[PDB]
């Protein structure tokens, strides 16, 4: 009897909605309206890395806040030195259709993936003096969209087959898989404790996973279009997403509901990246309007603008110590702001 | 300074190698091969001799690169921007089907990224299409047709119906009824690519 199942599912959804709405006594704006603003923020470029040739898509920082990594459609994956604008490595790829790159926290491995449905791992501390492929991970049915390191032995990967998996590099076997989504998964963020992670797909929804046990704990259904970015709050009890609706929203894990929206009438372009600050007061979000914006987290108003790119800002990132912020673009250029 | 001059020399060598590699690799033409299912793409690809298949060959001192992305069952909007700056498209249509092909062609021609990219059109399976049109008329799929029941008029009607979906004067479409021939597809592609590169050079020089 599918009718009874649908009716009980609808009843459960209504009960969930009522319970969620029963704990909304106040809002963030009313509490926060009694604090001083931050004024205006003026940032200027300091470095310009010009080595790539076509449409850099992904970038990532290192744990020492001194080394970078970049990937482009030209088929090259090179790592930079921010302080002296130098090049220290240059790794050629078998497939030129790459979309992601990750840096291991220890600094011994780098990973990349793309349209070939394969995640590759490179070793940077070989005794022969050259970087060589260590393992090739396969098993996904669709394209890859993100990859983050947990330690020097296991990795997490989100793909376009509406699924996520946890791997073991020592043997190349998919340990645990995660199912429950409907559309293509595009974003993935890791908690500071490395015991939970959230993801967002194209069905205008997001959910939290447990690494130890492959179960889903909560679900959020705020936006109305495809989610493209996600990032945990530095405290670890909140996160902010970004969609093609030209909006950004903040969610709370303990309350399980939205708190604020970041939108303006003069912005129509979508969001391609999102990042926080060291204290969590600032929020940086790249746009399709060839520029980026800085917004107050607790006040929901614009507090600056960054210009200088002639194409899409496809990636963003902030150092561990919060010293600088890096931006990448389709114009094959990288900039460091302070 | 310190021994950092060795690192500077390493960076200079890396930059020189990158420039040389880019110059060497910037001398090829890339083509997309979008189409329908069971449209005959594999047959012509093999005749010309899960992820992405990239077959390539050399004809008359020109290096080609063909990309087939039919193995991925996902929304096309997610990865259609990756194939920008492509020279042309090799859209293929079978005459023995068809509405899905027209819908896909209309969607492709009206895309924002491909507003200034030429399209080569191929119509396969001419002999068995003639046999079928002898067996049954074209009114089964095109009730609005009013002409006779021969082959040339039906081919012209189908070509006109496919061509009418264009909405940009800057686009050029090259139609062709291959009839499962041999050693003609390369010539047609070569002529089209020659025209495209001549136009691109004229535009780059400032004469457009």
């Amino acid at each position, epitope marked *: 009897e599918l009718d009874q199942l649908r009716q009980e599912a609808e009843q459960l959804k209504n009960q969930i909605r009522d319970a969620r709405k029963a704990c909304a006594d106040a809002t963030l704006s009313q509490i926060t309206n009694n604090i001083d603003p931050v004024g205006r923020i003026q940032m200027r470029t300091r470095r310009t890395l010009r080595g790539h040739l076509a449409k850099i898509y992904a970038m990532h920082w290192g744990t020492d806040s001194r080394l970078l990594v970049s990937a482009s459609q030209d088929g090259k994956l090179i790592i930079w030195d921010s302080y002296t604008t130098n090049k*220290v490595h240059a790794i050629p790829l078998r497939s030129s259709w790459v979309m992601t790159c990750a840096y291991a926290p220890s600094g011994n491995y780098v990973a990349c993936g793309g349209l070939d449905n394969i995640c590759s791992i490179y070793n940077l501390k070989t005794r022969e003096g*050259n970087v060589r492929v260590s393992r090739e991970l396969a098993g996904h049915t669709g394209y890859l969209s993100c990859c983050r390191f947990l330690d020097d032995n296991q990795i997490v990967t989100s793909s376009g087959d509406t699924t996520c998996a946890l791997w073991d590099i020592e043997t190349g076997q998919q340990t645990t898989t995660f199912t429950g989504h409907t559309g293509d998964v595009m974003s993935l963020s890791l908690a500071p404790d490395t015991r939970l992670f959230v993801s967002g797909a194209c069905d205008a929804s997001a959910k939290l996973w447990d690494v130890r046990e492959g179960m889903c704990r909560q679900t959020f259904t705020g936006h109305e279009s495809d989610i493209n970015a996600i990032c945990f709050f530095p405290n670890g009890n909140a996160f902010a997403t970004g969609s093609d609706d030209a909006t950004c929203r903040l969610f709370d894990l303990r309350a399980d509901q939205e708190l604020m929206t970041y939108s303006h009438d003069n912005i129509i372009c979508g969001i391609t990246s999102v990042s926080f600050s060291k204290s969590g007061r600032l929020l940086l979000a790249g746009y399709d309007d060839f520029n980026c914006n800085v917004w107050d987290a607790l006040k929901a108003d614009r507090a600056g603008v960054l210009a200088g790119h002639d194409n899409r800002v496809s990636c963003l990132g902030v150092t561990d110590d919060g010293m600088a912020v890096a931006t990448g673009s389709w114009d094959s250029f990288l900039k460091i702001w302070n | 300074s*310190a*021994e950092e001059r*060795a690192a500077l020399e*390493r960076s200079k*060598a890396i930059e020189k190698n990158l420039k040389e590699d880019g110059i060497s690799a910037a001398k090829d033409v890339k083509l997309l091969l979008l189409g329908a299912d069971n449209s005959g793409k594999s047959t012509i690809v093999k005749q010309m001799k899960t992820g992405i298949v990239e077959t390539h060959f050399t004809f008359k001192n020109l290096h080609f690169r063909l990309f087939d992305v039919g193995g991925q069952r996902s929304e096309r909007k997610k990865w259609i921007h990756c194939f920008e700056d492509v020279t042309a498209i090799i859209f293929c249509v079978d005459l023995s089907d068809m509405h899905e092909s027209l819908m896909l062609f209309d969607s492709i021609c009206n895309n924002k990224f491909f507003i200034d990219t030429s399209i080569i059109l191929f119509l396969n399976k001419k002999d068995l299409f003639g046999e079928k049109i002898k067996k049954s008329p074209l009114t089964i799929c095109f009730p609005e047709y009013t002409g006779p029941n021969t082959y040339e008029d039906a081919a012209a009607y189908i070509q006109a119906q496919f061509e009418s979906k264009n909405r940009s004067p800057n686009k050029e479409i090259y139609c062709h009824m291959t009839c499962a021939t041999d050693t003609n597809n390369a010539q047609v592609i070569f002529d089209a690519v020659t025209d495209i590169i001549i136009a691109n050079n004229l535009r780059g020089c400032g004469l457009y």
Partner: single-chain antibody
Amino acid sequence: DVQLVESGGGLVQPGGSRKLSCSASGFAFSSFGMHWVRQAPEKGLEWVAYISSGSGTIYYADTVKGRFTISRDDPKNTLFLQMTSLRSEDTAMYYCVRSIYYYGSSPFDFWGQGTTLTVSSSDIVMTQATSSVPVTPGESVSISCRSSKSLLHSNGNTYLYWFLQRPGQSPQLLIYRMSNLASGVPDRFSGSGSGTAFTLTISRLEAEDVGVYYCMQHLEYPLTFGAGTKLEL
């Protein structure tokens, strides 16, 4: 399996000329520099020549300038050293060392074996005020070095190295840049210093740590070594 084998040793009359070869097999030769450290029969190590990757820069010792040449054959993976007008002070054992230079690299990682050569009849000074010291198993020892000019650069890096040469063997690298431990060395060894004074700790001394220790600087291209300290059980 990194390996370096040398050939071209023997007896040379005064005023002659010879050549030395260094064959490499097991690593990327084109991305490494070359050095030609030599050792007297009963004395310390001395530096001779340097060949950069790509044959761009070549440096020579002031004692043999205008008298020797260094060249590299990348396709054949060989290193050459052509010397002319050999004198009576050129008798020594010649070593073949490799090094790579980038942010985080460890130069002087691997050393060759060495070939003998017998002939018939504005600088930085590193001082080691110790020549012999007795030790016992399970105890701790300390070695000190000093320099005339401070090795602490503006960027914050100190250029000091420590080496150990077991009897009848080839020297290896233990500590580079005064704080970093080389790969494969145990954790019993640690180094520290400030300015023109440095110290090495050999706590938990076993029977495999007997030899001579050397301290070297890499601030100026005329590289200089020390006298060394002997540690006998």
